[PDB]
């Protein structure tokens, strides 16, 4: 019993972290097989960072402009390409610790673990959601760039995020492992701002199902709702609209607790309207939107405490 923001064990990822230096900029990279990936802004000095041209800054570098240390051992660079907003460095050693892995782009609302690193050296692990406005509420200091986000499905590491920058809001922006940003952001120090965000409706509902599976029922009520009547209410409280696809994803959690989705929306409709009455759901005095339905199936018991 219990319910925590749980991250994936990080070992398989720790073995791919390295440090990458260019001039006097140092950040982290990820070493898979014989390639090291990192943000391309590693080739910038502070002056460059306001108006960089990467095509043009990169041709002014050779392989030996890049230092790659893994622990103690120096890795020699023998190749370099730009890929969108990342670099790819071919090196002379293949990483003996390369795990089974793949790269996926994730969708807003989805969730993942972040391994925070400084100077190629893992410092911590925590669990995140990709926000609707495409930021993350991470925790990062200077030198954290090239820290990655991931999931584990069985034996396989799904890399989905690389850290590039921090917004004025204090939130973070980055990239998939192909170099394509999440969001409208660009790797430059200019005026740039998070779009306004929204609460992840699908997730809140997942989290209410988790409360019930754990054996708490107080927030339920006897009503039902039409999808459209819910959405009229959702829009006024800045929630994402619920769609039919979202309703279908909540199927097995519906099946496990015998609560119909639309009954649960009615429950939420009520919580939004009347507050919680200074009470808690799974420990929280607020409605929690950073567990997906999948996050709830994995952590929770397959048997409801009825």
């Amino acid at each position: 019993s219990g319910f925590r923001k749980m991250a994936f064990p990080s070992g398989k990822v720790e073995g791919c972290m390295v440090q990458v230096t260019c001039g006097t900029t140092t950040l982290n990279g990820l070493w898979l097989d014989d390639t090291v990936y990192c943000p391309r802004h590693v080739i910038c000095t502070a002056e460059d960072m306001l108006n960089p041209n990467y095509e043009d800054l990169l041709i002014r570098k050779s392989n030996h402009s890049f230092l790659v240390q893994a622990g103690n051992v120096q890795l020699r660079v023998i190749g370099h390409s730009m890929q969108n907003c990342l670099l790819r460095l071919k090196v002379d050693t293949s990483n003996p610790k390369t795990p089974k892995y793949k790269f996926v782009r994730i969708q807003p609302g989805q969730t993942f673990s972040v391994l925070a690193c400084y100077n190629g050296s893992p410092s911590g692990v925590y669990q995140c959601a990709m926000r609707p406005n495409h930021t993350i509420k991470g925790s990062f200091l200077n030198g954290s760039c090239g820290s990655v986000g991931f999931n584990i499905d069985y034996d396989c590491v799904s890399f989905c995020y690389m850290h590039h920058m921090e917004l004025p809001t204090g939130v973070h922006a980055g990239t998939d492992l192909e170099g394509k940003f999440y969001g409208p952001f660009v790797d430059r120090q200019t005026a740039q701002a998070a779009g306004t965000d929204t609460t992840i409706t699908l997730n809140v509902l997942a989290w209410l199902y988790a409360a019930v599976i754990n054996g708490d029922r107080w927030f339920l009520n006897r009503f039902t709702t039409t999808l459209n009547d819910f959405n009229l209410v959702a829009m006024k409280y800045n929630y994402e609209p619920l769609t039919q696809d979202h309703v279908d994803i909540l199927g097995p959690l519906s099946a496990q607790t015998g609560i119909a989705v639309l009954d649960m929306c009615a429950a939420l409709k009520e919580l939004l309207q009347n507050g919680m009455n200074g009470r808690t759901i799974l420990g929280s005095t607020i409605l929690e939107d950073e567990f997906t339905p999948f996050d709830v199936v994995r952590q929770c018991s397959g048997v409801t405490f009825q």
């Binding site: 760039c145 850290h163 004025p168 200019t190 005026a191």
Partner: peptide
């Protein structure tokens, strides 16, 4: 502004 890290 914006801070690359």
């Amino acid at each position: 502004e914006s801070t690359l890290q």
